[PDB]
Amino acid sequence: EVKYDPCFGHKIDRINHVSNLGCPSLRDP
Amino acid sequence: SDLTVAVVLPLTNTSYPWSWARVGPAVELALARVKARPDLLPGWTVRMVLGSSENAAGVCSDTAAPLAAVDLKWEHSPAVFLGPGCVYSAAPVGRFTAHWRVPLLTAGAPALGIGVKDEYALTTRTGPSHVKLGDFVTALHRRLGWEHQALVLYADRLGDDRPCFFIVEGLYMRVRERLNITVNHQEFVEGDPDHYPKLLRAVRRKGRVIYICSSPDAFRNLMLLALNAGLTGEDYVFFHLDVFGQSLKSAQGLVPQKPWERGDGQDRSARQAFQAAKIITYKEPDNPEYLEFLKQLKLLADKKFNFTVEDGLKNIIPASFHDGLLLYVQAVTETLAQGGTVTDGENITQRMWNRSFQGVTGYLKIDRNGDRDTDFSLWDMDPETGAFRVVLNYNGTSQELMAVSEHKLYWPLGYPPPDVPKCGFD
Amino acid sequence: SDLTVAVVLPLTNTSYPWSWARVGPAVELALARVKARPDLLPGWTVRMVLGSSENAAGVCSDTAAPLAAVDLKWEHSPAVFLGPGCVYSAAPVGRFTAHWRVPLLTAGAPALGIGVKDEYALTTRTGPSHVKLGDFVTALHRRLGWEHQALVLYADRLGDDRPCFFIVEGLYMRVRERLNITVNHQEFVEGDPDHYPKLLRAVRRKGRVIYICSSPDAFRNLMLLALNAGLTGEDYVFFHLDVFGQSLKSAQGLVPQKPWERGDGQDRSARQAFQAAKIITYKEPDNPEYLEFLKQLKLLADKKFNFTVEDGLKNIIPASFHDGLLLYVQAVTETLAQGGTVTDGENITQRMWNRSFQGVTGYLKIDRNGDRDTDFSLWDMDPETGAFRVVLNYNGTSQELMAVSEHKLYWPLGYPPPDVPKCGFD
Numbered sequence: 001e002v003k004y005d006p007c008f009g010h011k012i013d014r015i016n017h018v019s020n021l022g023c024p025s026l027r028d029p
Numbered sequence: 030s031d032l033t034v035a036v037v038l039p040l041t042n043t044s045y046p047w048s049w050a051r052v053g054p055a056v057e058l059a060l061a062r063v064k065a066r067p068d069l070l071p072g073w074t075v076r077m078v079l080g081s082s083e084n085a086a087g088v089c090s091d092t093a094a095p096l097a098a099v100d101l102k103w104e105h106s107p108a109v110f111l112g113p114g115c116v117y118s119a120a121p122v123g124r125f126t127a128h129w130r131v132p133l134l135t136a137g138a139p140a141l142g143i144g145v146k147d148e149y150a151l152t153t154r155t156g157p158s159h160v161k162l163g164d165f166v167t168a169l170h171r172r173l174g175w176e177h178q179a180l181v182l183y184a185d186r187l188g189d190d191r192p193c194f195f196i197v198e199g200l201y202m203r204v205r206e207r208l209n210i211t212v213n214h215q216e217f218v219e220g221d222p223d224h225y226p227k228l229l230r231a232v233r234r235k236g237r238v239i240y241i242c243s244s245p246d247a248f249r250n251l252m253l254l255a256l257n258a259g260l261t262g263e264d265y266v267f268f269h270l271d272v273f274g275q276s277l278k279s280a281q282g283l284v285p286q287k288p289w290e291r292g293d294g295q296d297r298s299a300r301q302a303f304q305a306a307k308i309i310t311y312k313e314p315d316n317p318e319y320l321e322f323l324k325q326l327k328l329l330a331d332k333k334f335n336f337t338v339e340d341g342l343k344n345i346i347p348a349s350f351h352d353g354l355l356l357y358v359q360a361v362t363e364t365l366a367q368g369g370t371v372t373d374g375e376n377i378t379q380r381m382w383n384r385s386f387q388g389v390t391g392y393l394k395i396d397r398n399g400d401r402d403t404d405f406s407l408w409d410m411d412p413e414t415g416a417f418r419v420v421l422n423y424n425g426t427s428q429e430l431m432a433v434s435e436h437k438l439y440w441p442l443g444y445p446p447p448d449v450p451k452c453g454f455d
Numbered sequence: 456s457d458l459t460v461a462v463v464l465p466l467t468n469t470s471y472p473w474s475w476a477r478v479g480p481a482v483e484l485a486l487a488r489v490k491a492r493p494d495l496l497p498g499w500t501v502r503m504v505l506g507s508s509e510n511a512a513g514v515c516s517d518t519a520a521p522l523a524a525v526d527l528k529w530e531h532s533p534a535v536f537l538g539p540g541c542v543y544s545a546a547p548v549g550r551f552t553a554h555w556r557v558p559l560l561t562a563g564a565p566a567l568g569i570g571v572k573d574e575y576a577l578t579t580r581t582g583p584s585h586v587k588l589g590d591f592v593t594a595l596h597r598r599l600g601w602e603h604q605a606l607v608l609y610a611d612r613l614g615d616d617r618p619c620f621f622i623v624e625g626l627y628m629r630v631r632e633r634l635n636i637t638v639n640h641q642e643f644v645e646g647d648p649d650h651y652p653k654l655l656r657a658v659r660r661k662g663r664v665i666y667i668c669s670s671p672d673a674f675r676n677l678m679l680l681a682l683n684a685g686l687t688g689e690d691y692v693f694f695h696l697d698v699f700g701q702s703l704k705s706a707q708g709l710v711p712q713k714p715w716e717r718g719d720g721q722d723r724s725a726r727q728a729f730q731a732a733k734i735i736t737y738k739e740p741d742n743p744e745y746l747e748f749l750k751q752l753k754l755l756a757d758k759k760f761n762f763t764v765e766d767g768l769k770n771i772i773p774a775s776f777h778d779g780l781l782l783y784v785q786a787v788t789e790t791l792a793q794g795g796t797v798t799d800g801e802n803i804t805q806r807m808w809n810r811s812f813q814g815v816t817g818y819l820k821i822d823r824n825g826d827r828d829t830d831f832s833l834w835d836m837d838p839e840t841g842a843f844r845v846v847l848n849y850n851g852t853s854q855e856l857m858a859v860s861e862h863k864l865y866w867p868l869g870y871p872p873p874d875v876p877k878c879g880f881d
């Protein structure tokens with residue numbers, strides 16, 4: 001599962017999910 | 030002459046499937062069985078040193094857990110780590126233990142990235158992985174004719190462990206690794222009414238095979254609205270990704286199973302809608318040793334841990350800690366049996382990997398990647414009483430779907446609807 | 456009587472703007488100035504203990520750095536941490552130092568999440584932040600009439616620090632915090648030709664005001680393709696997010712500045728396209744003390760560090776470590792001056808926060824959030840020689856755009872094109 005994606009596979013640290021930029025969402029802080 | 034096992038888990042918060050009040054007694058049972066077995070580490074006294082993964086607020090933390098790990102590594106120099114179960118706790122701890130070359134054992138940490146064992150070296154996962162859910166969904170689509178389009182909705186936030194994000198990530202990546210069909214995915218916030226028009230609109234514009242990871246109440250509200258909006262099982266199928274069966278009761282009693290029942294007036298409407306709904310869960314271990322383990326776990330947790338262990342799929346986590354711990358002692362025993370030592374993490378780890386084992390959870394297979402194969406169930410209501418029951422099981426090691434108690438996957442049409450409608454989604 | 460300063464930076468790899476071969480001599484210059492000043496920490500002997508944020512391969516690490524931090528905290532019990540500069544190094548360490556209640560100082564770690572000081576307590580950032588880029592982009596749109604739509608392309612991957620992701624994240628969040636206009640964002644892989652048809656297509660369907668964070672060569676290729684596809688400055692404007700001016704030489708010599716020049720055959724076509732392109736960078740400190748600092752940093756790095764410090768915007772990082780350190784010693788001096796101690800992290804931190812200071816970088820303001828306000832320049836070619844020069848400056852503390860050397864923002868039409876075309880993008 002070393003495939004590339006804009007949302008998934010980007011390390012495990014809360015620093016990579018502060019904005020969910022590359023992830024289609026409906027939210028923000 | 031003695032083997033020290035460092036534990037990093039929620040030592041005080043009892044809310045987690047891998048909470049110590051629940052994994053502690055399973056581990057005590059496991060150690061008791063190592064004593065009884067003269068074929069497992071004879072004469073050694075396995076010692077347990079504990080550290081808590083939880084922060085000041087009591088929830089598992091990306092900071093308390095790695096700090097507790099360093100604290101145990103220098104105070105006690107252990108041979109193996111047990112836990113953490115939270116993803117954000119396990120990722121920094123797992124990175125430490127890989128650098129230390131100390132083996133790590135956990136029935137939690139199911140995230141896609143812990144799967145990268147080139148980074149998470151000597152991490153062995155004896156519980157579920159979220160890529161394994163991708164395996165089930167794959168076998169489901171192949172064995173049902175959905176080779177085109179699926180939609181995935183998942184509740185998400187910041188503040189918890191984002192379990193639906195990591196579930197969906199695992200499903201998403203593994204499904205597109207194997208089927209490479211179009212899988213759309215959208216994140217919503219459960220408590221926000223703004224998102225439910227957006228979701229419903231996506232449901233009808235983005236898929237007919239739809240997977241929702243969310244709380245039971247949110248999944249129920251989406252079904253009621255899909256009904257209210259004319260979305261029926263002749264054209265849609267909604268899978269609730271409810272791996273721990275939060276929407277269901279205990280498989281031991283509580284006959285029957287009505288997730289749509291809430292006592293809120295909509296129970297009639299909700300059961301109509303749930304005819305288009307199926308529920309994906311982990312499989313309840315069926316073997317007799319599992320039930321005996323549960324009885325003993327409950328006794329030990331009430332007595333030595335002042336905790337009351339209730340029935341439910343969450344108990345596969347302490348059972349898998351129990352089994353993984355025994356699987357480790359076997360490997361250490363064999364490692365010592367060929368001149369090795371309890372610090373030969375690589376040798377010990379490879380003995381555990383690509384290996385089948387018999388535990389209180391029954392058959393359990395560790396794959397070549399060091400992750401336990403995960404079995405899944407599929408629930409479905411029959412139109413008669415509207416009660417949901419297991420109609421399909423998935424054996425993660427053989428990747429086979431087998432019908433259950435001669436039941437059939439209820440379809441309002443008679444067969445599954447196609448992932449694309451008659452024309453386009455437009 | 457002596458103040459231990461723990462350092463966690465790349466101690467061996469010299470590729471980083473916060474590499475020790477570059478921050479080391481700047482910190483040594485700073486400590487020498489503390490000595491010379493009888494008004495800063497009189498009679499104290501400030502000690503430096505070093506740990507490396509970098510892993511076995513030599514790159515800054517989410518694991519080496521927090522391990523290095525714990526090691527320094529228990530061996531030397533320091534009063535302050537310096538660094539890390541990498542985002543993935545600084546997030547675990549910053550969470551550790553917040554838990555220890557030890558102040559942390561860094562001119563790196565510009566990520567949006569480090570800004571959440573309720574988590575990263577006692578973290579003071581004396582270098583650039585990526586939310587500050589959002590401030591500049593906001594002031595740019597307000598002062599130019601783009602209140603509708605913008606598109607952000609950024610080159611991202613896994614394996615490095617994902618600097619374009621964190622750059623874009625900060626821009627995206629702060630811009631929608633302040634303007635709440637529609638900002639589309641698409642990520643590409645630089646070395647993958649598959650993405651360039653996708654990018655070009657998005658450029659014409661998703662915006663006319665376009666920000667690209669990418670390598671200079673990628674940004675050049677995109678312009679050449681935009682020209683090749685009929686995208687001119689009468690209707691598009693491409694901002695290259697190049698904060699360290701990788702696409703430009705040094706502001707000291709190398710007159711003039713031609714990012715489109717490459718000697719590859721396309722230099723003629725590339726200059727045509729670059730007429731539609733402007734370049735956003737950090738601002739070179741203009742004060743005379745900065746140039747004196749550079750001369751001394753260069754000398755000290757060549758002599759005691761066997762490193763050759765070349766000119767360029769990257770030097771604002773070791774300059775900002777230098778200034779941040781003196782800012783801290785002032786606060787410690789004032790804290791001692793009112794009965795405090797060198798371990799009163801909160802008092803020391805609040806003295807540093809919401810405060811203006813004079814350093815080798817000139818005027819620098821730490822805002823209420825503990826982050827330095829960041830000044831930005833905007834480069835633009837005049838049509839005469841096609842050379843790019845600063846034509847606009849942004850003062851992050853006053854949030855002002857002011858014209859530079861009476862220059863004007865070159866527009867092929869005479870004025871900036873509208874963020875929406877005449878009709879829709881369709």
Ligand SMILES: *[C@@H]1O[C@H](CO)[C@@H](O[C@@H]2O[C@H](CO)[C@@H](O[C@H]3O[C@H](CO)[C@@H](O)[C@H](O[C@H]4O[C@H](CO)[C@@H](O)[C@H](O)[C@@H]4O)[C@@H]3O)[C@H](O)[C@H]2NC(C)=O)[C@H](O)[C@H]1NC(C)=O
Nearest residue numbers: 315316384385391392393394404423424425426427428429
């Ligand atoms: C999910 O699918 C898995 C995929 O196969 C199933 O695995 C299989 O499990 C069986 C046992 O349940 C296992 O069988 C044999 O295993 C031994 C190793 O080869 C072998 O020596 C055994 O033979 C002995 O015992 C039998 C009686 O059981 C005697 O009759 C024999 O003469 C012999 O003395 C045994 O036959 C398979 O190897 C194993 N397959 C794989 C591929 O690992 C899981 O059981 C299944 N899980 C569930 C819950 O259904």
Ligand SMILES: *[C@@H]1O[C@H](CO)[C@@H](O[C@@H]2O[C@H](CO)[C@@H](O[C@H]3O[C@H](CO)[C@@H](O)[C@H](O[C@H]4O[C@H](CO)[C@@H](O)[C@H](O)[C@@H]4O)[C@@H]3O)[C@H](O)[C@H]2NC(C)=O)[C@H](O)[C@H]1NC(C)=O
Nearest residue numbers: 740741742811817818819820830849850851852853854855
């Ligand atoms: C980016 O914008 C910032 C936003 O204002 C600018 O800030 C200003 O910088 C000036 C000095 O550069 C500063 O001025 C006064 O600051 C002292 C504190 O109030 C005050 O005591 C000073 O007065 C003394 O010295 C002057 C000579 O300078 C004498 O004539 C006076 O009689 C007095 O004895 C000084 O006047 C502003 O306070 C400060 N503003 C803010 C809001 O902080 C930045 O300078 C600007 N940076 C760049 C590089 O352009």
Ligand SMILES: *[C@@H]1O[C@H](CO)[C@@H](O[C@@H]2O[C@H](CO)[C@@H](O[C@H]3O[C@H](CO)[C@@H](O)[C@H](O)[C@@H]3O)[C@H](O)[C@H]2NC(C)=O)[C@H](O)[C@H]1NC(C)=O
Nearest residue numbers: 039041042043044045083085086087088089187188189190
């Ligand atoms: C045991 O663990 C429980 C789950 O891990 C935990 O529940 C949760 O409690 C947190 C608070 O720690 C709630 O979170 C919030 O986080 C920030 C922190 O300030 C707030 O500002 C937010 O508004 C947000 O509400 C979770 O929502 C909550 N979740 C659930 C499912 O309960 C328990 O509190 C823990 N119990 C003990 C005794 O430690």
Ligand SMILES: *[C@@H]1O[C@H](CO)[C@@H](O[C@@H]2O[C@H](CO)[C@@H](O[C@H]3O[C@H](CO)[C@@H](O)[C@H](O)[C@@H]3O)[C@H](O)[C@H]2NC(C)=O)[C@H](O)[C@H]1NC(C)=O
Nearest residue numbers: 465467468469470471509511512513514515613614615616
């Ligand atoms: C000093 O730091 C440099 C930047 O941090 C670093 O550069 C880069 O080197 C890494 C390898 O460490 C390259 O990365 C790759 O990572 C995996 C490792 O298994 C490979 O499989 C991938 O294919 C990928 O190529 C980076 O691409 C490279 N980047 C740049 C801009 O140079 C230097 O190597 C470091 N030098 C020393 C002496 O430590």
Ligand SMILES: [Cl-]
Nearest residue numbers: 082113114115
């Ligand atoms: Cl945990």
Ligand SMILES: [Cl-]
Nearest residue numbers: 508539540541
């Ligand atoms: Cl660093």
